[PDB]
């Protein structure tokens, strides 16, 4: 499918509301496995189970190991832009 740029607004006091799997050491993209009801990803729309996360805030996540991706994703604040695709 088409690569989408998706905006998520997160308050500083909360997480993103996503579960992810995958990463470089698994030979697959960072993938969204859950979108948690009533949390930012759910409320903001545009992000879906099965989407690969290609980048966040311009930071390339295509060749990133799982743990390092968790760090990068969890470190973002405020108005957070995701680059995602469903294949």
């Amino acid at each position: 499918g088409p690569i989408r740029k998706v905006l998520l607004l997160k308050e500083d006091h909360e997480g993103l509301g996503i579960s992810i799997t995958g990463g470089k050491e698994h030979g697959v993209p960072i993938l969204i496995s859950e979108i948690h009801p009533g949390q930012p990803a759910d409320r903001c729309g545009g992000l879906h189970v099965g989407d690969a996360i290609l980048a966040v805030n311009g930071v390339n996540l295509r060749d990133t190991k799982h743990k390092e991706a968790v760090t990068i994703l969890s470190q973002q604040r405020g108005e957070i832009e995701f680059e995602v695709v469903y294949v």
């Binding site: 997480g15 993103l16 579960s19 992810i20 969890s74």
Partner: peptide, 10 residues
């Protein structure tokens, strides 16, 4: 043994 795929919450 085979394992479930590592999953993280963020």
């Amino acid at each position: 043994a085979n394992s479930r795929k590592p999953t993280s919450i963020i």
